[PDB]
Amino acid sequence: SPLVQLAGIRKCFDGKEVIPQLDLTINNGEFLTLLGPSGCGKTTVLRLIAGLETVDSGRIMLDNEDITHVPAENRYVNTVFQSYALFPHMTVFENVAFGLRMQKTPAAEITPRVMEALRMVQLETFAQRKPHQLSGGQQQRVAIARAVVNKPRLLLLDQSLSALDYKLRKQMQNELKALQRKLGITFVFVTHDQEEALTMSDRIVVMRDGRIEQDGTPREIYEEPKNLFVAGFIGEINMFNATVIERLDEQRVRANVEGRECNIYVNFAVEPGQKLHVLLRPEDLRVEEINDDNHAEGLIGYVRERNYKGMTLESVVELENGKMVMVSEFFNEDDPDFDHSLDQKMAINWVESWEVVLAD
Amino acid sequence: PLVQLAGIRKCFDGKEVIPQLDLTINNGEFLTLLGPSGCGKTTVLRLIAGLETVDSGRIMLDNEDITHVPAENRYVNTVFQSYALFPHMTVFENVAFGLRMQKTPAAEITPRVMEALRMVQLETFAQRKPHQLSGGQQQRVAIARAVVNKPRLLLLDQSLSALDYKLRKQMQNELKALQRKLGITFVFVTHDQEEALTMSDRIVVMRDGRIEQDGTPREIYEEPKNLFVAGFIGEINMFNATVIERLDEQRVRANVEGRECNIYVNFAVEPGQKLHVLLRPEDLRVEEINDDNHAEGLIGYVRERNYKGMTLESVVELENGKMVMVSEFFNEDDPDFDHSLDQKMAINWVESWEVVLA
Amino acid sequence: LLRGGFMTAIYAYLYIPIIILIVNSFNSSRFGINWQGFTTKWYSLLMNNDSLLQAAQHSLTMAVFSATFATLIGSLTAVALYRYRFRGKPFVSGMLFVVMMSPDIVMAISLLVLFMLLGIQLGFWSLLFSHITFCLPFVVVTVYSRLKGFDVRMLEAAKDLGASEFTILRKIILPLAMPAVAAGWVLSFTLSMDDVVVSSFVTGPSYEILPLKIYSMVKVGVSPEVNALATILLVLSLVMVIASQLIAR
Amino acid sequence: FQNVVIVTIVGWLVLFVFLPNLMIIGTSFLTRDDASFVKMVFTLDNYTRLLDPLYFEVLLHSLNMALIATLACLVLGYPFAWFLAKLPHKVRPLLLFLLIVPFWTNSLIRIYGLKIFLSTKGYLNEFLLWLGVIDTPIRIMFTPSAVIIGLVYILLPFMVMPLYSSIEKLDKPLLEAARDLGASKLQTFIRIIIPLTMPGIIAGCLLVMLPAMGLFYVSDLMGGAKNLLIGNVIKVQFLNIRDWPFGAATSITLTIVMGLMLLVYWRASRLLN
């Protein structure tokens, strides 16, 4: 059941086209997160959805009703600001009830609604406490409570948890996911963090320069990238070059990667003489120790440094050609075989069928 | 023994922030001050830099007291968080500001400034006002400005806090290489554990004005001294294991929450004592079985499976009702791994990969 | 030690003539050079003077009216400037800055010439309009400066919550601008009670003000009746400012 | 609503500020008439009359007096603003409000009181003679010193506020970096603090200088017949002689300095950012 359908929306600002073209549909009952580098235009999409800006072209529909030209006072859409946009001269009760008091709501129902909305936020005690006496987390909670009471069909968040520390942010992540599951309305989140998007969202949309690049489950974007930018944006990736020689079977293709032959899994149709990209993640590369001509099978390279991150050990391997390869593993100090092998001739292997192959 | 602090006390408006601090800083080392918000690290930085005066104690460099010497006469420079960067003068004048106040002859100001800008790769932007540059260029200008006067120690206060996650990693290695090449001690204040672990040679952890632990990153991460350090850096799983009887010198018998599990203890104990068994999330194992029967160890109960990308964390509720928080790599392509919910699993360790505290 | 001494010296240099006037109000000497005892004759003599009291009443009423109108217009203009964002805001800022930094004599001359050409007899209306015109920029500057002590996104939050443009001013902007409005009214009242150039240029024989009466008496000689009037007006303004502050708070 | 207030304020300003200013700027290029004060003849005889030594010597004296008064106000006000910012924030508005309380009494009465206080046989001479510091009574009336003292006394508060606003807006870490890099108070004040506070200095100078050459009562009461400002000549020409074009021509010299100072302020503000 579609909820918001954006068809053919174009926006030009000061003679510059921030969003050339955008087709996107938002369903009902999910946690949607918009991701990308700074300057892609997520905030513009959020503002046009909320109605604070007008569109040069296109249509926006909610429940098959057109609200493209409806002013941003009758839409059933609420937003949460980055600075929390809190009124200083009012109290928590007044801030929360500002929305209800201006919908011609009967006075016999305002107090229980606000007071129970503070229950879902865990601010029971501070009903009569003014702002500038509350911490940042409590101010964010007040903003969320203020946005929730009106019971909208779509709640928009704009970098809500960017200004807090680590542990409190991690707590509010699970708190927001639980709140979304409990209420039953769709959430839209704009953020620059990666693990934050991967922890909560049921659907991730990546934008760059006003263009949509990928849309799918966190698994479908982390493990099946569509282009080089998406693969390099989330996590670390290793770009290898290969040339196709011949096809062995329906799921195996012979190729020459970095001057050495290897077997890879390619599904789409290929022809000899084509150039392919082989992308591997650091966790999937296994590196053995070659003390004196032992286990010298596979790609050959030299390790130059060994970084210690506390939880994981970071190693950089220099290949014969001159391409840097980065390998990440765990760190077990109290375990025999392991430890330092600063300078020698190493070999690099990976478990079969763990590759990601991209054409062109 | 470059900078030593003995009995330094600092009270701010009747409220005490540094009760008693003894600290010695050696020569040619990277030192990082770590802790939560509001623990007086910036106060120590300012006191060393000369921005404030102590109420008790003595500070020295090379056996010369500096307790009352003002900031202008001290051979110590600092890098500010906000990149002060006077707006009415260019980069060249900003870098040469320090030299002109030391009465440096005009025949050496330009080569020194140019070399300092070379050390940070800022040759081309020699004449640009500090508003046409980005954050990284401004930070490099500040760093180059601090290091021209050739000080005996460089003080850094949350230098790279306001940058992205890509330039931060590059400039961490850049700062480490610069410190190695130049040859002075660095003092860093940060709120991130990863930076301190990957960028330092000696870490001091402070909380409420007191030093909790000082040592190399290996000792700090893997051999904690109390329950605060074990838990500030990375997740920890605390288990109560009362000792009823002792079997031999190192192999002690412990009733770990009603279980039968023997562990390693390197210090003398007596029966009836209370011991805390600490394990990291990545040092625990699970066992998946289709049958609903409980076996292979204690109870198992999974709330969710997080899937934060690189790693997958699973909750394991025990009989007593406390979480376990396992963390381990997510290999998708697997013929026999893929998860199952709400089963009766088991938890195990790797034979003395743990840490035991009194 | 030395800082407080310098500040006290500046304050004493600014306040010494007032104490002299107050002391000479109760003095017996007509010229007031020396001290020759304590009398209350001057207050009784002032109480019987009619033109001086009429001038004082006219000055007070004029100050009140000009302050009220200037405060209203300036507050409206400042709210308009802050609420709406456009490329013309620096133009209006420069316009007000230029009208603020203008000589008093030039403005008085220009206003007199315009009023003479238009065919308007000098008096109440000319003085009131001149006072409003020269008191306008300060209230605008005060309210304009106060407003940026708060975030701008609050108005967008009100719009998203379902607020019309009329309710925003009543319920958000005005609560946060009342302390600035009171300050503008007090400043406007103070300025209009000290101007002597414009008032001396654009006044008429029908309306008589205190500066003109004092200037007329200067050529012949002034009596401590002016001192008594000054101290009475000082007490009245002292109670007025605290009353305005209490009303605002 | 959105444009109504803008239209109202623009119309008010145009009617009451710039239209009369352009009317007067053209009045100098007129011809003296005894009937309607103006005759539509374009003559330049008004300006060349200012080149006579009699009508030129007064202008230089007024300029010198204004310059000395402005410099004295700067020297006495910059330390006051700097020291006020280094005080607890709970007492700043009270001290900043006491600078305005004396303004409630009319300026002419205050000038008369100051004239009495500085008299030859009056106070500040009997007090300074009873406690022996000076041998003879000090004669200061009807001299440029009295005019400068009166101007400084009247116009002092108008310069302190812009300087305080500029100082309070400074960035504290900028000064700390200068101190750490090896700068004393003097070098810092010369090469960092003063450049950043130039707009405040220019605004204060504009607010003190231009009014100081229109105050005629100060020179009338404490200056005498040899110490005259522009305001006295303008008042005489506009209220007694009824030679309006001469006053219109004289006001142009006052407008030109204002324009030049505004240009300097604009360039300083542009360079600061």
Residue numbers in the entry:
A (entry chain A): 15 to 374
B (entry chain D): 16 to 373
C (entry chain C): 5 to 253
D (entry chain B): 7 to 279
What do the authors of the reporting publication say about this deposited model?
The PotD-PotABC protein complex in Escherichia coli, belonging to the adenosine triphosphate–binding cassette transporter family, is a spermidine-preferential uptake system. In general, ATP binding, hydrolysis, and phosphate release trigger conformational changes in the transporter, leading to the uptake of extracellular polyamines. Here, we report structural details of the polyamine uptake system PotD-PotABC in various states.
The overall architecture of the apo PotABC complex, consisting of two PotA subunits, one PotB, and one PotC, adopts an “inward-facing” conformation, as observed for the type 1 ABC transporter. In this complex, the two PotA subunits are assembled as a homodimer and located entirely in the cytosol, whereas PotB and PotC form a heterodimeric transmembrane complex, with both proteins contributing six transmembrane helices arranged with a twofold pseudosymmetry. Despite a sequence identity of only 21.9% between PotB and PotC, their tertiary structures are overall similar, with a root mean square deviation (RMSD) of 3.97 Å for the 247 pairs of Cα atoms. The only notable variation lies in the periplasmic loop 2 (P2). Namely, PotB has one more helix (starting from Y129 to L137) in the P2 loop compared to PotC. PotA, the cytosolic subunit of the complex, contains both the nucleotide-binding domain (NBD) and the regulatory domain. The NBD is capable of binding and hydrolyzing ATP, thereby providing the energy required for Spd uptake. In addition, it interacts with the “coupling helices” of PotB and PotC through a cleft located just beneath the inner membrane. In the apo conformation of the PotABC complex (state 1), the PotB (D226 and K241) and PotC (Y219) form the plane interaction network to enclose the PotABC translocation pathway at the periplasmic side.
